[PDB]
Amino acid sequence: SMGFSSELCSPQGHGVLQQMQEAELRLLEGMRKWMAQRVKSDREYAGLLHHMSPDSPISQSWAEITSQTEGLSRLLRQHAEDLNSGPLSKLSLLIRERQQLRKTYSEQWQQLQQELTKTHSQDIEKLKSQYRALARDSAQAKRKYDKAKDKYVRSLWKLFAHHNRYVLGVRAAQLHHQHHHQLLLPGLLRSLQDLHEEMACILKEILQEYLEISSLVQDEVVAIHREMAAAAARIQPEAEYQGFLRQYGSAPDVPPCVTFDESLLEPGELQLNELTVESVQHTLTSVTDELAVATEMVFRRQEMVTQLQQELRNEEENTHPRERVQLLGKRQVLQEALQGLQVALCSQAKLQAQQELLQTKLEHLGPGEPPPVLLL
Amino acid sequence: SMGFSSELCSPQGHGVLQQMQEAELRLLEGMRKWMAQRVKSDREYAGLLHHMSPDSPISQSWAEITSQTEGLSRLLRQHAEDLNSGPLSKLSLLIRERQQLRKTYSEQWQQLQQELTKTHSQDIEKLKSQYRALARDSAQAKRKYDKAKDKYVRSLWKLFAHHNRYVLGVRAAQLHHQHHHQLLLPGLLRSLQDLHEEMACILKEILQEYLEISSLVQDEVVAIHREMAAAAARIQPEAEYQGFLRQYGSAPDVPPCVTFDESLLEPGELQLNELTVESVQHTLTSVTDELAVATEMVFRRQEMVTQLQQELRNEEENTHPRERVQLLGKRQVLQEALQGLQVALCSQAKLQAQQELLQTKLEHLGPGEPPPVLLL
Numbered sequence: 001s002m003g004f005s006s007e008l009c010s011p012q013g014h015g016v017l018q019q020m021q022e023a024e025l026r027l028l029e030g031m032r033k034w035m036a037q038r039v040k041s042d043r044e045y046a047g048l049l050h051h052m053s054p055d056s057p058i059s060q061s062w063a064e065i066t067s068q069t070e071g072l073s074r075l076l077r078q079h080a081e082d083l084n085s086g087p088l089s090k091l092s093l094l095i096r097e098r099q100q101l102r103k104t105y106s107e108q109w110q111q112l113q114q115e116l117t118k119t120h121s122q123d124i125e126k127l128k129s130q131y132r133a134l135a136r137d138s139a140q141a142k143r144k145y146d147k148a149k150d151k152y153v154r155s156l157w158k159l160f161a162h163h164n165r166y167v168l169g170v171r172a173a174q175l176h177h178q179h180h181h182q183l184l185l186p187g188l189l190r191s192l193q194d195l196h197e198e199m200a201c202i203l204k205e206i207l208q209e210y211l212e213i214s215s216l217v218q219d220e221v222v223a224i225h226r227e228m229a230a231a232a233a234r235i236q237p238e239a240e241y242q243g244f245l246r247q248y249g250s251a252p253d254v255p256p257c258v259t260f261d262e263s264l265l266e267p268g269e270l271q272l273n274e275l276t277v278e279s280v281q282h283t284l285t286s287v288t289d290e291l292a293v294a295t296e297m298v299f300r301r302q303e304m305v306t307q308l309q310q311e312l313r314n315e316e317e318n319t320h321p322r323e324r325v326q327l328l329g330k331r332q333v334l335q336e337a338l339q340g341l342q343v344a345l346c347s348q349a350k351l352q353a354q355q356e357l358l359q360t361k362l363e364h365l366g367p368g369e370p371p372p373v374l375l376l
Numbered sequence: 377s378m379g380f381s382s383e384l385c386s387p388q389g390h391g392v393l394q395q396m397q398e399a400e401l402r403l404l405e406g407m408r409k410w411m412a413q414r415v416k417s418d419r420e421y422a423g424l425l426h427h428m429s430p431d432s433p434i435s436q437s438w439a440e441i442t443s444q445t446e447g448l449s450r451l452l453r454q455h456a457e458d459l460n461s462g463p464l465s466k467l468s469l470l471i472r473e474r475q476q477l478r479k480t481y482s483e484q485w486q487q488l489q490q491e492l493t494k495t496h497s498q499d500i501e502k503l504k505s506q507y508r509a510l511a512r513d514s515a516q517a518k519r520k521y522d523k524a525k526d527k528y529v530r531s532l533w534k535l536f537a538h539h540n541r542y543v544l545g546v547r548a549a550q551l552h553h554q555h556h557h558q559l560l561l562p563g564l565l566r567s568l569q570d571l572h573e574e575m576a577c578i579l580k581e582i583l584q585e586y587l588e589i590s591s592l593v594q595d596e597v598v599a600i601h602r603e604m605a606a607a608a609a610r611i612q613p614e615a616e617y618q619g620f621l622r623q624y625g626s627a628p629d630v631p632p633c634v635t636f637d638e639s640l641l642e643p644g645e646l647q648l649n650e651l652t653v654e655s656v657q658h659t660l661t662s663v664t665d666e667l668a669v670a671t672e673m674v675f676r677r678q679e680m681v682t683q684l685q686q687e688l689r690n691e692e693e694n695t696h697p698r699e700r701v702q703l704l705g706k707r708q709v710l711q712e713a714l715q716g717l718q719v720a721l722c723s724q725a726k727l728q729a730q731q732e733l734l735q736t737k738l739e740h741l742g743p744g745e746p747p748p749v750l751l752l
Contacts, residue, residue, distance in 0.1 A: 003621070008621070009628035009629070044420070044424055045417060045420075062583075093701050104708065163647050164646050175722070175728075181628065197616060211604055216448075216592040217592070225592065229587055232580065244396070250384075250389065254557050258500055260546050270539075275533050276537060328470075332477060336484075346552060
């Protein structure tokens with residue numbers, strides 16, 4: 001077995017233990033400052049996150065996410081409070097106890113040295129010095145020898161008694177030495193170790209309590225992050241306008257379509273007679289020529305649309321789901337081409353309707369003389 | 377099926393869609409600011425956490441925890457960078473595209489209205505107005521009727537031709553109206569919806585990307601927190617001083633124990649003769665009396681220790697593992713009582729050794745005359 005009581009039981013080991021006690025205070029002092037800065041950090045993060053602070057699914061998802069982020073803000077604040085009132089305070093009391101313990105150990109150590117020095121050394125020197133005086137005194141009285149015998153017997157009396165006190169003092173010092181080295185100092189060293197190991201345990205609990213309070217991955221944080229993730233995942237893009245259309249939608253507005261105004265003149269029929277036959281033939285020709293041009297314009301704009309759709313499918317296929325913002329420009333180019341095509345189909349359709357009218361009218365005259373104009 | 381093209385196909389729906397486009401810009405603008413503040417927050421938390429910045433197990437565990445906390449600091453910084461260069465930038469491009477799209481839609485809408493107004497209304501009014509003039513002209517020429525027939529046939533010629541142009545213009549306007557209301561405007565509205573739903577998808581991806589980057593509970597954060605937790609849990613309190621004792625420990629220092637200095641006078645034996653017998657009896661009495669007092673002092677200090685140990689076990693049993701800092705004072709009181717007891721056992725032992733010497737010496741004289749002192 002190793003311990004302070006068997007390994008540091010010396011003046012040298014006492015020096016080592018004094019420096020140990022200081023080194024452990026320094027370290028806990030750094031720990032307290034480090035924890036103090038975590039408190040500041042979490043508090044100010046709470047503040048920074050706090051500062052970040054309708055039917056629609058995105059709308060509702062967005063509100064849920066901001067609200068949960070505000071929840072995260074308050075949590076970080078509680079981390080700061082909890083760290084401050086729990087382990088930082090416990091750490092401070094542990095420092096204060098060590099500062100007092102430091103003093104108590106060193107004075108108990110001194111006390112035990114002074115006691116040993118007094119009993120084992122100083123008392124002993126005093127006895128020895130007296131013994132020598134009384135012996136020299138008895139020697140002198142033996143030599144200076146009725147009255148003379150009287151002073152000599154007296155010399156012997158005190159010398160003998162002092163001898164006995166000396167013998168007893170030596171035995172007392174012997175047991176002091178023994179208790180000191182085997183029991184007293186080892187006992188003191190052992191209790192210092194016990195205390196320090198208990199304090200190691202306390203510090204372990206302070207560090208684990210710190211980690212639990214300050215953890216960004218604990219249950220309350222996870223639960224916040226899952227709600228945010230569920231809110232985002234609920235977004236259904238193809239459903240975003242359903243509620244908006246329910247609120248604001250209505251039947252199309254279609255103003256009346258023009259008709260042939262019969263108050264000017266069959267209603268809306270071409271006039272095919274002797275004065276107009278050639279003009280109708282001319283118009284059918286010029287309408288048909290124009291229709292050919294318009295039909296070519298539809299053909300070319302459909303090809304353009306087709307080129308853009310192919311280009312967009314290849315681009316889509318090759319772009320990551322989170323980089324689709326990059327396709328928006330081309331999407332818009334495709335829209336404008338589709339609008340283009342639609343305008344051209346409208347023009348083609350208008351010229352076609354005009355041809356049909358012209359064509360059916362000349363067909364229904366056929367091999368007939370165009371009607372004369374009689375003037376009533 | 378509901379959609380922009382069936383539900384908002386009117387001037388009113390166009391107003392609704394214009395306000396929609398603005399409301400969506402406002403919302404994305406708030407989202408961009410909110411994300412911008414997350415970036416600032418994470419960056420400054422990185423800074424705050426950064427600022428927090430030997431054999432022994434606590435030592436090594438502590439270093440691991442500070443080092444991992446520094447790792448957490450760098451991660452938060454990467455969250456800030458990644459948020460800034462990914463989704464915040466994508467969000468900005470989405471805003472810019474909407475600002476251009478807003479303009480394109482509204483001018484395409486205007487264009488289609490101007491075309492309809494031109495063909496379906498203005499051209500038609502021009503034809504109608506001319507028709508009426510030419511009819512009144514023909515009426516007047518019919519009435520003012522050789523030359524007279526000439527001007528009348530001419531009147532009819534132009535009236536008939538204008539009639540035909542009018543009829544054709546009406547058919548053209550009819551098809552315009554039809555294409556406009558069924559195809560052109562619905563087509564435009566549909567592509568706006570397609571675009572918006574695609575943008576809803578893009579925004580969903582921006583929000584999910586935000587959540588992934590900024591998550592405090594993601595794998596890289598968890599791994600940091602597990603290392604910290606494993607480091608703290610490794611601490612073995614009963615092992616904290618093993619390496620320290622290996623480095624600094626040494627054999628106890630035991631200076632020589634006093635012995636009876638034979639140069640003054642059996643070596644270290646009490647002198648029991650006629651001049652000392654009574655004094656030895658007196659000393660045994662006074663030593664024995666003192667021993668009784670010292671034995672009582674050991675008894676009382678053992679009782680005190682016992683009271684404190686019981687008090688500390690009850691206190692320990694009733695205090696939570698993380699509140700043990702609160703027992704340190706009482707622990708220290710117990711230490712001082714145990715030291716107290718040890719000092720008293722030393723004193724008892726010293727007086728006992730002295731009694732034994734005195735007692736054995738008088739026992740071995742027993743019923744004998746104490747030796748005379750003869751004076752050579």
